[PDB]
Design a protein around this nucleic acid. Structure first.
Ligand SMILES: O=c1ccn([C@@H]2O[C@H](COP(=O)(O)NP(=O)(O)OP(=O)(O)O)[C@@H](O)[C@H]2O)c(=O)[nH]1
Ligand SMILES: [Cl-]
Ligand SMILES: [Cl-]
Ligand SMILES: [Mg+2]
Ligand SMILES: [Mg+2]
Ligand code: NA
Length: 327
DNA sequence: CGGCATACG
DNA sequence: CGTA
DNA sequence: GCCG
């Protein structure tokens, strides 16, 4: 078992679901308290279990696994012995955890805002609605649309949405393309949103594209919310339903075709996979990775990539398809 | 102990 | 600060 | 919280 998640296949479904979900509660709770290091260890421990070829049935099977020390091992031990971990249940039940979870789920609210509101005594969505003066326009939208946005987007929803985006993109710039990325590209059957990557085969033609796309979508009546030169858009989209419609989150990003492999890798995730891949690049290979490129700071040169495969090869890593990046 | 991914709106 |  |  290698120490970095980008060094091993992680499938979407696996053999240690209950154990990884318990560790991810502790990870989440760590984040709500601002402990990014603890969050990372619990996420990595969880992810290690996702990568195992069979269920953990005894504590000894943790020996030598990376990211399992005293704390994570005890969590697993208790689940194996009793079916529950007391620390985990205590977190689940706590007012702090439940309210930070509820508040950070709102589009436009992060940990810092949730925490402030929590300290101010606020606890429910209706608490927030009563004092609407204190909300940003983004948060107002997030709160109005919260019920719809809390329902999963279905894979079976995605194609219709992609078609609508393609129509607008084609008018904005003939020849421009739309690629499904994010969780659905990793094989998820549901998601919190739909993430699309846009480019054009002629380098440079994509400059100024996203505002054109957004204005067209808004003219079609499809945009319930968006922030408006830019290259990322975080929207709320109108998605048809039987006799009605629902709000869904849609992310759009534009990249030049030279950067497309880096953007595709970066947006396809998982989020933990990308963090680990970047950490690996920098700490093991001395190369700086982001969604735009891969930089050698000694030669002061960028690696040209024509494919994700190129990028894995330049990092000396075995290729992982998107389905195996579910760290 | 230091480090923990990296960027855009 | 928010967001991916 | 864990790794190197
Ligand atoms: O903090 C982040 C968030 C997101 N991302 C990158 O952006 C991608 C989409 O970010 P996302 O929030 O849409 N998550 P996703 O994996 O699609 O699952 P879901 O919750 O169902 O939408 C993620 O999969 C990462 O590749 C980051 O790199 N860092
Ligand atoms: Cl589906
Ligand atoms: Cl980036
Ligand atoms: Mg997504
Ligand atoms: Mg997204
Ligand atoms: Na939020």
């Amino acid at each position: 078992m290698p120490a970095y998640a980008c060094q091993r296949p992680t499938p979407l479904t696996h053999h240690n679901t209950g154990l990884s979900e318990a560790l991810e509660i502790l990870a989440e709770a760590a984040g709500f308290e601002g402990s990014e290091g603890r969050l990372l260890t619990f996420c990595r421990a969880a992810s290690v279990l996702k990568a195992l070829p069979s269920p953990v049935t005894t504590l000894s099977q943790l020996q030598g696994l990376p990211h399992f020390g005293e704390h994570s091992s005890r969590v697993v031990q208790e689940l194996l012995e009793h079916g529950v971990c007391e620390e985990v249940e205590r977190v689940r039940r706590s007012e702090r955890y439940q309210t930070m979870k509820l508040f950070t789920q709102i589009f436009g609210v992060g940990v810092k805002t949730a925490d402030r509101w929590y300290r101010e005594g606020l606890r429910t969505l209706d608490d927030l609605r009563e004092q609407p003066q204190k909300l940003t326009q983004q948060q107002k939208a997030g709160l109005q649309h919260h019920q719809d946005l809390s329902t999963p987007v279905l894979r079976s929803d995605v194609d219709a949405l992609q078609q609508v985006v393609e129509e607008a993109v084609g008018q904005a710039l003939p020849g421009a393309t739309v690629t499904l990325t994010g969780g659905f590209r990793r094989g998820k059957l549901q998601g919190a949103d739909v993430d699309f990557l846009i480019t054009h085969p002629k380098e440079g033609q994509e400059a100024g594209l996203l505002p054109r796309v957004m204005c067209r979508l808004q003219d079609q009546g499809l945009i319930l919310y968006h922030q408006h030169a830019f290259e990322r858009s975080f929207c709320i989209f109108r998605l048809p339903q039987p006799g009605s419609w629902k709000a869904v989150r849609v992310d759009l990003v534009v990249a030049p075709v030279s950067q497309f492999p880096f953007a595709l890798l970066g947006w396809t995730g998982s989020k933990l996979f990308q963090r680990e891949l970047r950490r690996f690049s920098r700490k093991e290979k001395g190369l700086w990775l982001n969604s735009h490129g891969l930089f050698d700071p000694e030669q002061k040169t960028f690696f040209q990539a024509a494919s994700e495969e190129d990028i894995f090869r330049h990092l000396g890593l075995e290729y992982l398809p998107p389905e195996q990046r579910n760290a």
